Design a binder for this molecule. Structure first.
Ligand SMILES: OC[C@H]1O[C@H](O)[C@H](O)[C@@H](O)[C@H]1O
Ligand SMILES: *[C@@H]1O[C@H](CO)[C@H](O)[C@H](O)[C@H]1O
Ligand SMILES: *[C@H]1O[C@H](CO)[C@H](O)[C@H](O)[C@H]1O
Ligand SMILES: *[C@H]1O[C@H](CO)[C@H](O)[C@H](O)[C@H]1O
Ligand SMILES: *[C@H]1O[C@H](CO)[C@H](O)[C@H](O)[C@H]1O
Ligand SMILES: *[C@H]1O[C@H](CO)[C@H](O)[C@H](O)[C@H]1O
Ligand SMILES: *[C@H]1O[C@H](CO)[C@H](O)[C@H](O)[C@H]1O
Ligand SMILES: *[C@H]1O[C@H](CO)[C@H](O)[C@H](O)[C@H]1O
Ligand SMILES: OC[C@@H]1O[C@@H](O)[C@H](O)[C@H]1O
Lengths: 49, 48
């Protein structure tokens, strides 16, 4: 070869930069609703006379 | 002839292969050409 290995004046290039991190786990889920509020008392019948 | 370069090529072999999942084993080869001063006599000189 024309110019031998002793005449290679270039400088070596850096290593590969690292690989990116992984994605996150899917977030949880908003708390589910509550069961319908219980109805009120029921008015007793007419008072006697 | 005097005052020309010359290519010294070294090939190194390890008894056990580097672990497959681990990083590369990084080596620093310190070299004394055999004609200049008396060569380092301690590992500190080789590492310098
Ligand atoms: O468990 C019944 C439930 O119903 C609805 C109300 O908001 C809560 O205070 C509770 O009374
Ligand atoms: C309430 O209903 C379901 C589960 O009960 C859903 O996953 C959410 O937790 C919320 O919307
Ligand atoms: C690093 O790479 C360059 C090639 O550009 C050169 O061969 C150096 O000798 C090597 O150490
Ligand atoms: C990523 O790292 C490599 C070497 O580890 C190199 O320096 C790149 O320039 C950097 O972006
Ligand atoms: C992710 O990226 C780096 C280079 O950026 C390298 O290729 C790793 O092998 C890959 O996992
Ligand atoms: C919901 O939770 C996930 C984590 O699993 C994500 O990182 C964010 O905190 C949010 O999108
Ligand atoms: C009366 O009590 C509740 C309401 O207060 C409900 O409607 C019942 O059906 C009734 O008995
Ligand atoms: C008639 O009924 C009412 C309900 O509020 C009450 O019990 C009285 O004592 C009765 O006279
Ligand atoms: O992975 C270690 C080093 O970077 C990349 C190559 O495998 C090697 O040069």
């Amino acid at each position: 070869l024309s110019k031998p290995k002793t005449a290679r004046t270039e400088q070596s290039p850096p290593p590969p930069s690292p690989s990116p991190p992984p994605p996150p786990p899917p977030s949880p889920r908003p708390p589910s609703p509550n069961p319908p509020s219980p109805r009120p008392p029921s008015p007793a019948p007419p008072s006697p006379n | 002839p005097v005052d020309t370069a010359t290519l010294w090529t070294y090939n190194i072999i390890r008894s056990v292969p580097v672990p497959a999942g681990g990083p590369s084993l990084p080596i620093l080869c310190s070299f004394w050409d055999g004609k200049t001063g008396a060569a380092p006599t301690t590992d500190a000189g080789w590492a310098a």
